[PDB]
Design a protein around this ligand. Structure first.
Ligand code: 91O
Ligand code: CL
Length: 260
């Protein structure tokens, strides 16, 4: 099963986009992650490639090349392999320790800060898009619904990403305008909660009820495991339902739980 210089091996990830397969480059004798899509708009895929091309940071994945045959339904995006895979699956019954979560969250901060400087809102931050590399550090993946903006922030009206991680101000259903950086902070907060608890803070298999909880259910902490007050404060500040008072990234950097 060959595609120019790449030999497609087993599937390593999966999603609505298609699949990611391990891949072997015969030229340089090296494994890569191959994202395979099937046209079925396709514009959005090319928006991601444009964003990805501009990105160069240790906590962000690296697109290597794009293989697009006008006469083939499949479109191939070659990424550098982040060899240990997602940092966790949600839900799990073995969440990370605080110090493990702190370690990874520190990577998340650096990556998100870089993307915002580069004027990219990620919009699909979640533990399964945080890939763990050879040195144990996280790289941010799946820019499938990211936005680029001009100015100091994005002014958005569309609702995309993973539902359990969407921010309440993006679920208005009246097409209201909301700012972009605070959407990534919210999802970072859901993510950190997942790190330590192994489940999202707002769950419901009915989508209406999931939206309702995100918009109107006060954040609740499980008795177990008994996490630190300063970590509760940080998650509480990141999951502030009012994006105007929600904690910003420069404050997250300085937060007591992050710096200890
Ligand atoms: C346990 O071993 C494993 C090692 C690596 C993986 C893996 O790489 C999975 C996802 N890969 C990606 C997906 C993307 O979106 C769908 C994008 C993007 O579109 O930005 C980039 C990448 Cl790299 C999985 C398991
Ligand atoms: Cl996840």
């Amino acid at each position: 099963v060959q595609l120019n210089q790449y030999t497609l091996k087993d599937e390593i990830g999966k999603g609505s986009y298609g699949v990611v397969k391990l891949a072997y480059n015969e030229n340089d004798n090296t494994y890569y992650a191959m994202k395979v899509l099937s046209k079925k708009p396709i514009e959005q895929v090319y928006q991601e490639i444009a964003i990805l091309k501009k990105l160069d940071h240790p906590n962000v994945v690296k697109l290597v090349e794009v293989l697009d045959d006008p006469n083939e339904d499949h479109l191939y995006m070659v990424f550098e392999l982040v060899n240990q895979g997602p940092v966790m699956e949600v839900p799990t019954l073995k969440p990370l320790s605080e110090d493990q979560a702190r370690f990874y969250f520190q990577d998340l901060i650096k990556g998100i800060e870089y993307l915002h400087y580069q004027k990219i809102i990620h919009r699909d931050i979640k533990p399964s898009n945080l890939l763990v590399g050879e040195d144990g550090h996280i790289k941010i993946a799946d820019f499938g619904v990211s936005n680029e903006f001009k100015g100091s922030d994005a002014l958005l009206s569309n609702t995309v990403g993973t539902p359990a991680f969407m921010a309440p101000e993006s679920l208005s259903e009246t097409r209201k305008i909301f700012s972009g950086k605070a959407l990534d902070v919210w999802a970072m907060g859901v993510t950190l909660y997942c790190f330590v608890f192994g489940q999202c803070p707002f769950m419901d298999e009915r989508i209406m009820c999931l939206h309702s909880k995100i918009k109107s259910q006060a954040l609740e902490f499980p008795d177990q495991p008994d996490i630190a007050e300063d970590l509760k404060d940080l998650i509480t500040r990141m999951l502030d339902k009012n994006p105007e008072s929600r904690i910003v990234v420069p404050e997250i950097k300085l937060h007591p739980w992050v710096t200890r």
